Symmetry: C2
Subunit: 636 residues, 2 copies
């Protein structure tokens, strides 16, 4: 199962073969044996393993212990597992014998120069030059290095390495080249890679160990496809490779680096390869523990920021604030994982105009990569539309990193470049949904995942006008139809206070909400099929819908469109019907959520938001702790 | 495992749902049930199947036979397996009951309009909307239709169908649309496909059955991505799809066609898809039975044509002749297979200048497709360099259609476009070899497969200078060293007659042939690894090599470079050393080949060929009978 070479010898003059450690070499001859050959012996220098074997069977046997009956169907294998100290310091001698004369008929001498050449980066073990998925898989992982680790950088753009810890983001690659030095006066050692892969990653050799930035010499890049390793350190050269791109429509995600020994007296005689896989971008669903909460602070945002602050302080989350409102629409905080340094990465939306500067200015710290996709020939659904489900099992397949959720229309959608990127990540197969019926059309407007210690660890919450129908009808059956919805609130336009009886007896509103629930039910069945969830995991949240056109906006603050930080969720305060001094919508929300251990804090956001068609989740972003499940053993 | 719909009803007014035959429909309600509901009954029109089932378990049970205790966790499924004869001719009625009053509390009525819509082409059986490989696989096959079946055509270029049997090359696609006619006054039926797939195939509707060419109306093409089926024939519309491209670097080979029912009062409510796979181009190795032999006839080709004729008449082969010599370098005759019409297809080389006109002029008959690949920014190895091995097993994988064999260099080759095409065929994974050492550098110069009823059904024959060393040395050991090689031949340049002693005692020639055999041995080991052959299947043919530069040409006529037609092979007549009135090279060739049942006829081609660096296989092409193994159950 190794490399096979055939080196033929002649009875007239000896040969001077060069072999690689561990590799087998078949030994045969040019021309015929002596005229009366009946037997033969073979001998080898210490450190030279010689085996005899028939060409039919594959059992090997030591060959330097007897006189073998001659047979053209036998073959001799020479292996040197250790490199030579000097040129041709070992040799093989084949003597041909006959029972007639006592002396050998002829000799065949082959001197050997053994060289130990090997290229290895990180053979993930827990094995050819192939990358395979699964728990029984192997292969090296290469990151994309999309951050700014050096204080001077304002990391993929430089052809130099001017940071002392940016190297932590790269992948090592060691080339051992043991053997006689004079051999390298006759033979070349060449590292190389295909030009396509050369445009996707860069390699740096080392010329002074671990201390000098200028010592990390760039050897492979955009135009540099090959390089001659001078063996500056001796018998081992160290390289650092950094990726330049993420898996995309045209890039499968694998890059090959080869080393080759050439005989320029040129003919190559050995080549070794190493295959890296570019680690993909992984999204974090709301079920994971949060790390940093992001929220804006605008000219009239007074208590929304205070509520987000005082409510994220319960889960121990950060509070980075932007001076310029939809901080969940501009960015999605995922990550890219490596066996050495897994770093979070922001994906910046092409929906620009308000926070278009925030990611490239105040989000890529030392360990914070940045990636973005802008189409050539516009986004209307963008990163409110981009969510991710928890790990699921459906259609027989298992999705241990969950699945991506994006919106669109069936007969015609989010831009094709973002779709191609998400589908090319290959680790969270997206599910395109029906969202075109909403005004802005974001997935998080009707769907939200919440952690709950029962059933599957989580509950999928869907907005349902039928749930609000039932709640308002049961309250009519109690007599509270005269309770008013928009009663307690700082008049933002003197919004007229409607009552339960007025809502239930408005034929147009009820029929439109029936249509809305039909849309959400189509999405519900698609979610149950593509995520493998049952009704035990699906909870309907009461929500009615307004409209000023053929598309749908929220009537009262959207209850699913909340901020989920582990055990604590910030929900927009539903300025619904007060029945006993407490909002009955809040009571229903509590009866549905608090039995799951969660704590519901409702935020007044009627004046800052919900009048510009947004809720707390639309104005609050969050990055989360990566999955415990590692992405390489995923078997797509 | 089918499509799931949820249609909600109201106790105030009935609903008018439209359903698809076979599809299940969950029935729920907007709002709550009557205030004192304890039980319920459900009833359905004949032909309406109603089942009750808990939302936890998946056992279904008929629901219209008892009064069920009310439970919100129960669900009712409605299925109509047969289309309706008139709008809303069937209905479901849900009555809500209490033990207090004897009459029903409330009713919920849902009228149903059932439509039977299905798109099917050829579900290969021996099952979703996916194409899977293997004996247990399914899916439709679409050809590329690269021939000229109509007498007027001079078939992928026309947007019309002006042939009566060109339709045999296309694939059928039937759309059944049973149901009430008035429904189609309210609903649209739309066939469609993605624009990428639209550029790869065309679809024609039928407006008059089986007789009129203008009736095969073009409905889907380069710009036409969607079409409205008018139901011109009633409850079933017939379409004919023809492919426009072969699998390539950017084309995986799958095209999807969808049908959709729209409600323009528009909202789609059902979509059905059909996935075709474009059949690839398959090569035929020399082991298969031949059909047609091609050979040129040039201004001084007198007996080579006669020998090819009189030697192909033994296997019952055709004899198409071109008036303009390398007919095996310009074209490769493969085929494309379909469950209805498998047609042979020529692949035209970009090595042009002598026979550049032959394929597009005198090779694409009625059933003979044409495909070609020309690079933007030149071929020096071309279709002498392109061969194919018999079915093999190696690296665990099984290659039942053999593997493709092309030449090149390791450290840098055949053009990248041809490589991408061959690799994208996906059915015969190519093996790139070392051929750069030869003058012209074609695979067939040193390698040829021959049928032999033993071992594996075939023998791989490799040119070997060591075999010629052994033969000439054993003849020296007999005393025939004074036998002359180029003795019997019509002087083409008064080529000097060399003898065995002169050859064996020429140090430069022997060393160069040793180097040549080392190259061929590298290729031999790569072939044994990538094809899984042993020495029992490998036969070495004696062949020496000349040179006028650093590259290698043949010394005497190349013995492997022969024409293999099943049981009969035409070999270039080796004008080698005559020892007993018979060429000893011919005697060795016979001793190696004739024990395999084959019959060896040696052709004098020294004056026509072998002086312009070519042999019989280089001047004779042949197409062969396709494999008995069908390509779809290949599991790549
Ligand atoms: Ca850097
Ligand atoms: Ca960095
Ligand atoms: Ca870093
Ligand atoms: Ca932006
Ligand atoms: Ca998001
Ligand atoms: Ca046609
Ligand atoms: Ca045709
Ligand atoms: Ca035809
Ligand atoms: Ca051509
Ligand atoms: Ca060929
Ligand atoms: Cl000898
Ligand atoms: Cl409900
Ligand atoms: Cl009621
Ligand atoms: Cl040999």
């Amino acid at each position: 199962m190794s490399l096979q070479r055939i080196v033929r010898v002649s009875l007239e003059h000896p040969t001077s073969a060069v072999c690689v450690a561990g590799v087998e070499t078949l030994v045969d001859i040019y021309g015929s044996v002596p005229e009366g050959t009946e037997m033969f012996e073979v001998y080898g220098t210490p450190g030279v393993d010689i085996y005899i074997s028939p060409n039919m069977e594959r059992g090997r046997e030591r060959a330097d212990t007897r006189r073998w009956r001659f047979d053209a169907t036998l073959e001799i294998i020479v292996v040197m597992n250790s490199p030579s100290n000097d040129l041709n310091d070992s040799h093989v001698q084949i003597s041909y014998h006959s029972s007639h004369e006592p002396l050998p008929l002829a000799y065949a001498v082959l001197y050997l120069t053994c060289v130990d050449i090997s290229l290895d980066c990180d053979l993930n073990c827990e094995d050819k030059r192939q990358w395979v998925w699964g728990p029984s898989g192997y292969g090296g992982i290469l990151l994309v290095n999309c951050d700014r680790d050096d204080p001077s950088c304002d990391d993929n753009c430089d052809q130099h390495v001017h940071c002392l810890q940016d190297l932590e983001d790269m992948s090592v690659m060691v080339l051992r080249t043991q053997g006689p030095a004079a051999l390298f006066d006759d033979h070349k050692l060449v590292l190389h890679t295909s030009s396509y892969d050369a445009k996707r990653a860069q390699v740096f050799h080392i010329c002074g160990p671990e201390d000098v930035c200028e010592a990390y010499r760039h050897v492979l890049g955009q135009d540099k496809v090959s390089y001659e390793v001078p063996r500056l350190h001796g018998d081992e050269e160290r390289f650092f490779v950094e990726g330049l791109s993420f898996p995309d429509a045209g890039f499968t995600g694998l890059i090959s680096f080869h080393v080759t020994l050439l005989d320029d007296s040129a003919s190559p005689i050995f080549t070794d390869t190493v295959v890296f896989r570019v680690a993909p971008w992984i999204m974090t669903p709301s079920t994971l523990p949060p790390l940093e909460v992001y929220v804006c602070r605008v000219r009239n945002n007074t208590c929304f920021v205070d509520a987000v602050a005082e409510l994220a302080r319960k889960a121990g989350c950060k509070l980075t604030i932007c001076p310029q409102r939809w901080i969940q629409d501009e960015m999605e905080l995922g990550y890219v994982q490596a066996p050495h340094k897994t770093l979070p990465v922001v994906f910046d939306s092409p929906r620009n105009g308000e926070l278009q500067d925030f990611p490239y200015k105040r989000i890529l710290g030392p360990d914070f990569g940045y990636v973005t996709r802008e189409p050539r020939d516009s986004g209307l659904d963008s990163f409110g539309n981009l969510e991710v489900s928890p790990p699921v099992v459906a259609n027989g397949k298992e999705y241990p990193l969950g699945r991506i959720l994006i919106g669109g229309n069936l007969p015609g959608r989010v831009t094709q470049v973002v779709r191609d990127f998400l589908h090319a990540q290959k680790v969270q197969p997206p599910v395109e949904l029906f969202v075109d019926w909403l005004a802005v059309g974001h997935v998080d407007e009707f769907l939200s995942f919440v952690p709950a210690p029962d059933g599957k660890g989580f509950r999928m919450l869907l907005a349902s006008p039928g749930a609000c129908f039932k709640l308002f009808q049961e309250k009519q059956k109690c007599g509270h139809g005269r309770a008013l919805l928009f009663q307690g609130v700082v008049d933002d336009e003197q919004v007229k206070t409607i009552s339960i009886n007025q809502v239930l007896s408005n034929k147009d509103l009820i029929n439109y909400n029936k249509f809305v629930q039909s849309c959400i039910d189509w999405n519900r069945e698609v979610l149950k099929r593509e995520l493998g969830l049952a009704e035990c995991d699906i909870i309907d949240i009461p929500q009615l819908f307004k409209t000023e056109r053929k598309k749908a906006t929220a009537f009262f603050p959207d209850l699913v469109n909340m901020l989920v930080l582990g055990k604590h969720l910030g929900i927009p305060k539903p300025f619904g019907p007060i029945i006993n001094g407490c909002c009955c919508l809040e009571e229903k929300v509590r009866s549905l959520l608090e039995p799951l251990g969660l704590h519901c804090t409702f935020i007044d956001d009627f004046t800052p938001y919900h009048m510009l068609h947004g809720e707390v989740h639309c104005g609050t972003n969050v990055c989360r702790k990566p999955f415990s499940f590692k992405w390489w053993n995923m078997v797509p």
